[model samples]
Target chain A: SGFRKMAFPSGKVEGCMVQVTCGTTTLNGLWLDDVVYCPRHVICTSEDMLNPNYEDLLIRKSNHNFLVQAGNVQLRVIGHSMQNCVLKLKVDTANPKTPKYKFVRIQPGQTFSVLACYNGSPSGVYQCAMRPNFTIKGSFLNGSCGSVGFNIDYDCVSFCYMHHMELPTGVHAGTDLEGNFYGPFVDRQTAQAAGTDTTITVNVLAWLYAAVINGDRWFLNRFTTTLNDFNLVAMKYNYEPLTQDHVDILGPLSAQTGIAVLDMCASLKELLQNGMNGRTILGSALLEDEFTPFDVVRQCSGVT
Target chain B: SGFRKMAFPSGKVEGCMVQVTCGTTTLNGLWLDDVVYCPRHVICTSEDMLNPNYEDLLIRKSNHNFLVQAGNVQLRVIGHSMQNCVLKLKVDTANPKTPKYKFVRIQPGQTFSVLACYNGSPSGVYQCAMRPNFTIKGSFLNGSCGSVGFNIDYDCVSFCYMHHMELPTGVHAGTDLEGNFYGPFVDRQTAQAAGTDTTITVNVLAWLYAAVINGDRWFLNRFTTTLNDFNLVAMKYNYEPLTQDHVDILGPLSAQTGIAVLDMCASLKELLQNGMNGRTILGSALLEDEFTPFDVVRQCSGVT
Candidate 1:
């Protein structure tokens, strides 16, 4: 949960769910240090209690490392799930890739722990994925650490121009390129290649669509069959940073039809996967390369 | 799956999985296209029976829609009984943030029409609880679109340091500080405020750890800390990156209680999340601020 950063030392906290308290509450989870666990596996019982005003309950290991338990319960599963569990911790992107983490079996459990310290200085993250076979319950800290969630997926396909020798890790430069499902977003290569074609039609469709849906100025455009105009929209605020909501609507369109951005175009592919090798999905000069990062291409698409 | 790229058409798609013809028998799937249907969903399977060397499949809507059958699987019976069917897709983070298509219910004997385009664009990812359902064998297309996936969960978490700002959104100054999860590594504000007792200890511990890990040349100092005297007989490699890996072993034996390069450090936090931010975890200015970067810390740790 958003409020309780750690579920360890206790089984399922309830501070955020009910009006209760135990000791000091460390509810605010850090993006760099926390993980999300599937609740069905939680073993909530009546004995456990959590802080209401301060704590956000989540299943954790009991001192004894036995049964699972619930620390909080208000019974508003749907709405609350979306707001807290889904929204608060989400890793927004232009569009997510395929084969994302779902129904995962983090053997044992999914949680972080401090194994040992080096010198007086602490070293790297000591976190590890829990064993899958261990008995899982909200109460036990032993046997399993939980899983931290991440989108880890971005756009499946993106197109770019060869004007720059190196395209970013998330983008690919070519002419008349077509995304698998998303397509025809651009004609940059087409226009540059031939400069004119009856197929050349510019109506600001993507921008127009963005105007309606997000009240912003961004969208995908693919008019020409010969050239490609693929762009990954970076930070744009129309009262809000473009979010998963935007990706949900715009991502497919960009992938399917493709989009066009001015010279400073970031491919949707790069925006989706946020490449490694120090490359990210966000449009950045550092990520420019001739090919899309390997992870970006494999993860973003719906295929295996 | 990690082969060259190719293309295909509508009829060529086997259920949701599309295969683009490659050199002879080799083929690469353009996985971004669409979702597969359940049971007999591959009614209109196609192949180049003639050569068998190269093959492609397609489905036609004008004619009788291909009918792929369905089976009662573990997923359908496990959870609370529902009328709607589930749509299952996979994610591959190796590429980018994996996107999972949400599940929709289609009752037995129900005839649904499957379309090429998704209800709309997609975002971060959709959360799917697997226990309530079970795995099933299926195929082909189905009609009946459901609510689209949202990115609220994704946007809140995806950004790294360059993007992980203090507020909901905004471009920060060069050293603009925001967000409360700053510590483990001191920030500009806490450096002075924490006082010499607290500050010096933290810095000393960090430098000592670095010296032990890297040595006195770059991260180490010939004078202060005198970490070079530590025995390397039991240690591993000499010049590993000042990462959590090294911290795991030596961070405890040293005087300080914490490693200087824990993920909690602001720079590391930023490095971990900033999809494209260029500033190294050890900002260039770190040395000037009476603190040392992990690199220098490693160098200074060498024996005097």
Candidate 2:
């Protein structure tokens, strides 16, 4: 005997469905069962499947709909049909047509969460709509599919940390790898006033550690394969990994000058020892076969 | 006149079949003569059509079963219908009802080999069954579909190498980026006993090289554009790239690890010396205006 249960990411499944049985297996609230197994929609109801055989359940509907709750974005939807569907989210400042949210498929009873879309930054107000598979014509869910709005506190800490190498100085607002926003806090002071944040300090320390490891090919080798080994080495030298409190104190700097704070590294040699001394401990894993000349670039020349 | 030959991965075709001819050509045994390419089964009977063009093939009984032997897996089947069917596979240890094998569509005469269900690691015992499509749910060749089993040696070197950062000390079984498994390796000794694995040795060196390059934003700039120069640099220092034999010492490791190990770092220090050692020699194409910190971070950081 076989019974299957459906789990959705958000909301609840609705509508009419039928039950079908073959041999000793029974699939309840299903639309159709065929040798080809296509055209099956993700349907959900209040009742549960008596027996849930993982293999028997259809994999086509795996992307039907699910909920993701992380960071500052939350999304909800009602049904996604056809092949890979694309949803567009837009704010007032950006172009309505050709907005940034692309390839979003949702089930009737699921919610999808995501970062900002316009210019890859965050926004307090936004609208949602689905795009048809290719004819190139459509409108926002016209009340036919419910419409929703979003108001999220942009995550500048992640934004600034990732963009530090690029946008360092003054105030900034930009997008991240995952379409999230950063900046708008003109400098470290601005960022500090907003909340208890220390991204700038953490990032600076990470970069310093990054620079030191860069100088020693042996250390670099261990650093990349596993941070644990490098961390152990750092501990032996009392160069412990950066902490939340360390960055918290420098929150004011992040809010004021943003990533521009890293420019101070030009004189780090005077503040701390400049070279790595534990060759045997760190070089234990550094095999002779791993040596390469790329090790001597100005990048690995330690902090300037 | 069609004299097309059926090429397989291994062995030759020998079974219940006959040969026939059309205008000016002959086919060993096939049945077809349709513009839409339908109604054709893997027919083995003695019959020939008068006219022969490439497109004409029966589509209805397209699943007329055939056999194939390749790798360590051998699969056989008969009679599959419907367009673009999704076949799912399942194993005994995992939930048999909702199997992990998804969307495996095969032709009547083709053999498909895949990993185990559930955890996605390779397995020795597995079963095959046809999934039902809409308006159609049934068997391929009655109750005698000829069930086959699998006993693939899982690849763990690739598994451990990839997850090496987090799972270094322990003997572990883990999933890869592609959802494949590596190990049950128990521990370092167990993995080492399997073969002369250089992944750990090799990875450490590569990381050091990566760190050095990561430090020099400009070098990171050059490194990203091409490993060609870097490889040349390695060549100058007598270091070579990974080879088939290098990873083959551990047959199971190579087979299971899938990704061959690469040796990193050689003449990199000489190439850059300090900054741009030679514009034409090192910067044959290194434009002066190409220095953008964001491009260096996004591409070189290996995060995005």
Candidate 3:
């Protein structure tokens, strides 16, 4: 499901740090005074949900522990899943058929949170994907006493930009000097280099999308190709603030092409995701070295 | 599934205004220069999709025109469905049982827009719930040409608050001078006159939740009582912008109830819907006569 926000008087940060190691990446989950880990991923196989020693691709983590009612069960090991991203929340059972919870994905600088409390304050949000048969709904928040709360937080400490273009996570954004953009980089270095013949970024939004398909490669590739073929890449850096004039014209333009906004525009969604104030990261900004808040983008969009 | 933002150089606002009258509530839809009216509701029966003569609840609207591959079909009549809100988009074929699209509902500021452009500009979002088998996705945006966009916009022109408390759209919000609140009114007037035994409020977000169950009545009723039973209505206006201390206690408390945030926080979700900037039109605020911007609450919560 999703998360509930916590409230508190400002003060010291107090809470347990919940960590999950998926492949080489060890992701941090919500911080609360108390946490109950039924681990959504294969990484849950270990005795401790925070154990980093269980790291090794995802093979060792595959042998999981599922509690049953006096039933002898044989579990399966599909084996070794690898990830470089900073989030993963799975609601899956491996009997050849099963999967689950709010899925979170963010980039480096050690910041990727599905939910976070602002500094050491009481307000925070926790989002997760839920398993179909899972029963303990919403217990994570109220499950403890004496204040189980947020002890951690995150910010877009840095962002990479090239003529102010925004692209999805993992999908590289490339733009030319004209401000026209392009891509879904299948390779890293090439994706890292933009402002060329349209070459540039990768991201958090696509990673969230990839969770829907088990991996981001599929959509990232499709998204890149779609933008390029349809010349929709230019739409990425559009910071004029959305308007009716724009809506009427582009509305049909987007529909004329079948991909639409839902299947495409991951970065846009990231900017508009829950808990976010439409902040921009990825690879596009006013100054190649500046960070633009969504409010500014909102202002330029001409919205009151 | 979701919407896209259109960016314009800024100018005139021109677009077709679409309508769907469900029950006594004749709701207005998106304003696009060009529109593809597939009629997601039962109201597409008349020769002209815009014909106002064919009115009489959903019964008359139910006699629809579905394009099939020369298949003779006898449509049955299950008449007279009513509504009081401003939106309904159905992707249904009723033959004993069937059902729909993006469901929108807002108070009479005529402000309930599932998607809207910021006046005469290009930025806007189009969100519609997708039918499982419906093949055409994201076509609404690109379905037309030469300016099919937003000609509409909305704001919290009026909001009813008792001592700065925020509540959902349709759920009556009643608060004491002490800032405490209560409800889930089954009766309109009682809901309308909140702030007593904690009497008070009704609204938009609850209407959206009602769409999930084919109406807003069920969830609204449950939501009201849930809050009353658990003292959550007060939480609606804690407007400190959701903190960690708040999250920890409320999280587990919500979970202990098993209803969870996904099942419970409709108004909150509406406030944070896709295109919104976490603005509050709900029944809470800083002063009894003021509208509090979410940013202020965000600042209070200490989120950077």
What fraction of the correct interface contacts does each predicted structure contain? Answer: 0.00, 0.00, 0.05
Docking class of predicted structure 1: incorrect
lDDT by candidate, in order shown: 0.20, 0.20, 0.23
TM-score of 1: 0.19
Q: What digit string (tens of lDDT, one per residue) describes model 2 on residues A134-201?
A: 01011111011111111111111011111111112211121222222233322111222222211122
- Stretches of candidate 1 above 4 Å error? A1-298, B1-279, B282-304
User: What lDDT does model 2 reach?
Assistant: 0.20
Q: After superposition, how far is residue A193 of candidate 2 from its true place, in Å?
A: 21
- TM per candidate: 0.19, 0.23, 0.24
- Lowest summed lDDT window (length 10), candidate 3 chain A: A1-10
**What tens-digit string does per-residue lDDT give for candidate 3 at B108-199?**
11111112222112222221111111110111111111112111111111111111111222111222112122233221112233222211
lDDT per residue, candidate 2, B172-272, as tens digits?
Answer: 12222222223332212122222221122222233233233323223332223124554454344433433343233323322332322232222233332
Per-residue CA lDDT of model 1 for A1-304, tens digit only, reads 0000111110011111111111321111111111212211122232232211112333243212222122232111211121212112222211111222222222112222221111111111111122122211111111111212111223221111000101111121111111111112221212212111111011122322222222222322232221132322222211112333334434443553344322113332233235234322222222212111121222123222
State which candidate, 1 or 2, has the greater TM-score.
2
DockQ scores of all models, one per candidate: 0.01, 0.01, 0.04
The top-ranked prediction according to lDDT is 3
lDDT: which is higher, 2 or 3? Answer: 3
